[PDB]
Amino acid sequence: MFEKLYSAIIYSDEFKKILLGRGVDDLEIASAYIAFLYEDLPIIGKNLCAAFLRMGLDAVYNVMPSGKVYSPRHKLYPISRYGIDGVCINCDGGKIILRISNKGYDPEDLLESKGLESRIFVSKNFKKKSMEIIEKIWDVNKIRLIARKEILERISAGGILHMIR
């Protein structure tokens, strides 16, 4: 049920290590959870995991150098433009601001949330909490190695330089 969500989190993590040499952030993973709940909500800002959930490996062609994804067809925007009433992941534009708080949602608590709010907070260490949930259920190391090979196959279709461009 959460298969599509957890896969997007592992795959986006692997691609970011290839692209920027580090893995996805607490809030980048949070954006995947938001995209999972609200399929037509625009995600603005640190939105890389949400991009993999909505676009799959095709997200690779729309990543900015910042690691933010621009693909309007999937309602993903690196910065806030006029009229996009979306969630701003770690930023102050859009209709809803999403940031980190002591008493913000844990991954499980966020999936049960039944409504959107003008401001949204996720707990600290959201990434660490979310990975532990996935590690229980899957052999994450085997999944990462498959993801790496599949991402590398994608990049090598037309090459690093064409894919960036």
Next chain:
Amino acid sequence: MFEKLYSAIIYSDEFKKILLGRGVDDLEIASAYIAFLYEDLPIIGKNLCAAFLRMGLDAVYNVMPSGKVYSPRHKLYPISRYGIDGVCINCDGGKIILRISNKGYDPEDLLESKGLESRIFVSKNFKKKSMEIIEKIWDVNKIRLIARKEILERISAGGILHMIR
């Protein structure tokens, strides 16, 4: 005695497929043969395979968007500059010019060459003849899969973006 040369050819083929979505050309492979025979000769032009022979995996940090390598320390130049008396792979500068001829050297014959004409020629399908030799010695697929893992590992250190710069 030829393992480092054949390895450089397979690794550079795999890296070029990641960088530009295609394999190495007949004369890019020939440039490694030349680097192998003449360790101090500057190599100008289509020179990627020579770069891996001389720099190993460090060649990935010095590739131009043309797939030509710039590393003065390793006598590798993408274009001919004043006083660089080197072999020009597929170009007309330097002191020696290397191109394809219907009568040009085969890989075995080139390895047996004992001096340096003002105009060297390699035969057509030099890449095919070279790949056909290497494939009689190793399971090339095992090499490619290792080269991929190690190239990707190198790229992911600082990420694709920092590497091509």
